[PDB]
Amino acid sequence: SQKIKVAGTVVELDGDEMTRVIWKMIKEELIFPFLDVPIEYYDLGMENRDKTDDQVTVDAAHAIKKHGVGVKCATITPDEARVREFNLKQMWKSPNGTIRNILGGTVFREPIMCKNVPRLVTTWKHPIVIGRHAFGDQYRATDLVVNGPGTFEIHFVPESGGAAQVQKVFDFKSGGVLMGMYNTDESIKDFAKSCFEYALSKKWPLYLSTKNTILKRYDGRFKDIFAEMYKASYEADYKKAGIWYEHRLIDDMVAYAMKSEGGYVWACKNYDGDVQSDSVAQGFGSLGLMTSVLMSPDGRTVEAEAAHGTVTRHYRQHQKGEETSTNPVASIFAWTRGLMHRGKLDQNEKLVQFSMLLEKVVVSTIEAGFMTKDLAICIKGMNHVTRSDYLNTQEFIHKLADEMRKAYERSKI
Amino acid sequence: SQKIVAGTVVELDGDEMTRVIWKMIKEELIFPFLDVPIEYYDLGMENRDKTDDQVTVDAAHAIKKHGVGVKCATITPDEARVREFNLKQMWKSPNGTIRNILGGTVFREPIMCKNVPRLVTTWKHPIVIGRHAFGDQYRATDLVVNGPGTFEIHFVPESGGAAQVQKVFDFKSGGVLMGMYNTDESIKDFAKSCFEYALSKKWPLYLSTKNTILKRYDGRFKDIFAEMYKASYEADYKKAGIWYEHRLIDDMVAYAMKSEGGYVWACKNYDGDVQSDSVAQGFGSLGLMTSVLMSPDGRTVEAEAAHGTVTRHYRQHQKGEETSTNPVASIFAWTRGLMHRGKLDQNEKLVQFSMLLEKVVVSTIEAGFMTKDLAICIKGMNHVTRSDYLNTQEFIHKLADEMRKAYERSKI
Ligand SMILES: NC(=O)c1ccc[n+]([C@@H]2O[C@H](COP(=O)([O-])OP(=O)(O)OC[C@H]3O[C@@H](n4cnc5c(N)ncnc54)[C@H](OP(=O)(O)O)[C@@H]3O)[C@@H](O)[C@H]2O)c1
Ligand SMILES: NC(=O)c1ccc[n+]([C@@H]2O[C@H](COP(=O)([O-])OP(=O)(O)OC[C@H]3O[C@@H](n4cnc5c(N)ncnc54)[C@H](OP(=O)(O)O)[C@@H]3O)[C@@H](O)[C@H]2O)c1
Ligand SMILES: [Ca+2]
Ligand SMILES: [Ca+2]
Numbered sequence: 021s022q023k024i025k026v027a028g029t030v031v032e033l034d035g036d037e038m039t040r041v042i043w044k045m046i047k048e049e050l051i052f053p054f055l056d057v058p059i060e061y062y063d064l065g066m067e068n069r070d071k072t073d074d075q076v077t078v079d080a081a082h083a084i085k086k087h088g089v090g091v092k093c094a095t096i097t098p099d100e101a102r103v104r105e106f107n108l109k110q111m112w113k114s115p116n117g118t119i120r121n122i123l124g125g126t127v128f129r130e131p132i133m134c135k136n137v138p139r140l141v142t143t144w145k146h147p148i149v150i151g152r153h154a155f156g157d158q159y160r161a162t163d164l165v166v167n168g169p170g171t172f173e174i175h176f177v178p179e180s181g182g183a184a185q186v187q188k189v190f191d192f193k194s195g196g197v198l199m200g201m202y203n204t205d206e207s208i209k210d211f212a213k214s215c216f217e218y219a220l221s222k223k224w225p226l227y228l229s230t231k232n233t234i235l236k237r238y239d240g241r242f243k244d245i246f247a248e249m250y251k252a253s254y255e256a257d258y259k260k261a262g263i264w265y266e267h268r269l270i271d272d273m274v275a276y277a278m279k280s281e282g283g284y285v286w287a288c289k290n291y292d293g294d295v296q297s298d299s300v301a302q303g304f305g306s307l308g309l310m311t312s313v314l315m316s317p318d319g320r321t322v323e324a325e326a327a328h329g330t331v332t333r334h335y336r337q338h339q340k341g342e343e344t345s346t347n348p349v350a351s352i353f354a355w356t357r358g359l360m361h362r363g364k365l366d367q368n369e370k371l372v373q374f375s376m377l378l379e380k381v382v383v384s385t386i387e388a389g390f391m392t393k394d395l396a397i398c399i400k401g402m403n404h405v406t407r408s409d410y411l412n413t414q415e416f417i418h419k420l421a422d423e424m425r426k427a428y429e430r431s432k433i
Numbered sequence: 434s435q436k437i438v439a440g441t442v443v444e445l446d447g448d449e450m451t452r453v454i455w456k457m458i459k460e461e462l463i464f465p466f467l468d469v470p471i472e473y474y475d476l477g478m479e480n481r482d483k484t485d486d487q488v489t490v491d492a493a494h495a496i497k498k499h500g501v502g503v504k505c506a507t508i509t510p511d512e513a514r515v516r517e518f519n520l521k522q523m524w525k526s527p528n529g530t531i532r533n534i535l536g537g538t539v540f541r542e543p544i545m546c547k548n549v550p551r552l553v554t555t556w557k558h559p560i561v562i563g564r565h566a567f568g569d570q571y572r573a574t575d576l577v578v579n580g581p582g583t584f585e586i587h588f589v590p591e592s593g594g595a596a597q598v599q600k601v602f603d604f605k606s607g608g609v610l611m612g613m614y615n616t617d618e619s620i621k622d623f624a625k626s627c628f629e630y631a632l633s634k635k636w637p638l639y640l641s642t643k644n645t646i647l648k649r650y651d652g653r654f655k656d657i658f659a660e661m662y663k664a665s666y667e668a669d670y671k672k673a674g675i676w677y678e679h680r681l682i683d684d685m686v687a688y689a690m691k692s693e694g695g696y697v698w699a700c701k702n703y704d705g706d707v708q709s710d711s712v713a714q715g716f717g718s719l720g721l722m723t724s725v726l727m728s729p730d731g732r733t734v735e736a737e738a739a740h741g742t743v744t745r746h747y748r749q750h751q752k753g754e755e756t757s758t759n760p761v762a763s764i765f766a767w768t769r770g771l772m773h774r775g776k777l778d779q780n781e782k783l784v785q786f787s788m789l790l791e792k793v794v795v796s797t798i799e800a801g802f803m804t805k806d807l808a809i810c811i812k813g814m815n816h817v818t819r820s821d822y823l824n825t826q827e828f829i830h831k832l833a834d835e836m837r838k839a840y841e842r843s844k845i
Contacts (some may be wrong), residue, residue: 041508097645140555141554151622159644159646161601166614168590169591171589172588177582187612196614196618198586198612199586201611201613223655227639232511234573236575237577240512247471270443271741274708274711275714294643298687299690301687402555426711
């Protein structure tokens, strides 16, 4: 089904469980009818990441860097329960963590605002953008079970060959756990750049959260890198733009974030950008109401995703042959932002107007009273929602399609 | 001033605004009523630096001895603090030191005021966070890396064989590295205390980890809780109409945001730290939260303010400007400490004194007398004016006025 021709190639990464089911329908009804789109397909379904030894994940990452745009459905990350469940050869790493490792950059997350959906948090008047650092820390770590007594040490061995630098971290008297993790100056700096630059262009303030009182040298490095770069390259233009940058302790930032009105960029270390960008997304209404875009330092490569998970409890219900009502908006906006970036790379204005148009139609369709259960909950009580207040997953997508077909037909005479 | 205590309470003095407030609470709401032995330790930054942080260690060991510890918020120094106080070094968190020595779980909970509107529209009931007090980020070894090399991790068995070595990372230019740990023993301890506490509340229990990413580290948290539920707690919980569940941290923070509450949330050191601030501020103020570190045996309580020393307000204070610093958390550290002092001494009268003061604080807030953070909760941020609240001193005084009437009012 072709209409708008797209020269560029979109690298699509398929995922798992309920999101995989919605992914198919989104392609089927919202994208392909309108777009003549070259798709380099990569199945990051869990079975296929097992079949290929996770190499499908690595190749997909590399294919995104080549073509410039990636669009990824939520995937399962496996632990022991999951290894059992699929008879996996191993506990494979988060495909997300692997993609992010290879690409680098920053994951910008923002709520998708629907005026008829009450925010959960009375104070939040404006959107918060989270710049989550995509590299290192707890997401590329080495952890270990300890089985008996013994001493946990770190050796740093320099390249020159000067002697080993060792630290006794802990004497274990019994079983326990240990782990090491890292970050790089180079990375933190790209993470500083893109955050400073995004807030400069939104004309908004920038907060950095760390726990540099505790991790004096580790988090300390982030604080100093951001402060050094601010003085050097952003203070003058920030002060001229009527905005400001400040380091705040993670403690104080979450309290501020909860009570403030929004209108600022909040830069988080990896883990905080993981946790808080869900607290935020649910605060604004639902996990399905959020964009998530991994951006290059150079602005040429974009991996757009849904930030939420595979919606396992909903899939278990879909698998019984029971009805589901799962919010597909975050999956759809993975596509639109990917296609928007695709069109920017190609000098293709038609593609950008389509991407924007699909975002308008989703938001407008929700705004006109047509919505999945989770948004109906935001409006009507937790226990005072009924079947007539919301559309199921299929209907919602169907309604969305009806509207998109109509809007597109009218759109560019 | 006294009237009411045999057993001893160990007092830990702190920094900045919480210090200023700590004094007033002792002056006006505690010592006037209680004749109590206090073992005083000054964890103000100057004395920590001056004693090479030994008063902190001494304070932690005093708490184990007499069984009750009451602690004011302290500074934990980074580089700017070292400059500011002319410190010998970037001393580690005194809280992190107290907890490393004492072990256990820090249980936190909002202090409900009916005239204070919640910021989260869905929260009908309290959320209780159970924070693992040990290990992980708060007893870790972190370094800056200045040039390329290899970050290895060695475990050297007691048995004397050979080291178990993992390559973590090949550095090319500069960075940071850290190493951190926890123990089966502490994690197990953390679980039992959460299971017992959610069992006695007849409330469900959630543990959150990121075991999909930290598969062995967080996996151990998840495996230990699960095995303990099966063996020791699943049957009793099912009889009580409650459950235990592990959720991924992503799932739990989203759930907590849309839940009505009424559950005990088991949090890893880092998560309990951060999510207890998000939860206190979601309920109305950082001022309106309790925080009680409990020992595995439950013979030893350290109570505190979970929030910081309120540096921005200390600075107003220093210039002679008017402050409205919420003192309720600092007050409830006294009351919960003493509650346990009374629990230990079988002092029926002291348990009730603590209970009464808590009653009077909230009851005073609910009669319209409050500090500026709580006025901002009722009126808007931009619509509060001076007449909606009391400054810090007046507020403590109003409570003080109020507490005397109340106490005098009781038994007679
Ligand atoms: N983007 C990614 O690649 C990504 C991110 C996170 C996790 N994961 C992986 O996916 C799985 C996550 O499962 P999880 O249950 O922990 O997290 P989850 O799949 O994000 O779902 C958690 C819950 O949040 C609500 N929710 C999330 N997305 C929703 C949507 N689109 N529409 C409606 N409700 C939604 C539902 O609550 P109710 O039950 O109340 O309806 C749902 O049960 C794990 O296997 C994990 O490895 C992947
Ligand atoms: N228990 C502890 O020992 C503990 C805990 C946390 C931090 N700290 C230490 O405290 C110092 C400063 O930390 P921080 O500035 O990150 O956080 P903070 O002192 O907790 O205060 C940060 C902000 O939260 C609000 N706030 C906190 N407590 C309040 C109260 N009792 N009444 C009214 N408002 C209150 C204020 O908001 P507004 O600005 O909006 O008025 C304040 O500016 C650091 O040295 C840190 O290491 C100690
Ligand atoms: Ca997340
Ligand atoms: Ca905290």
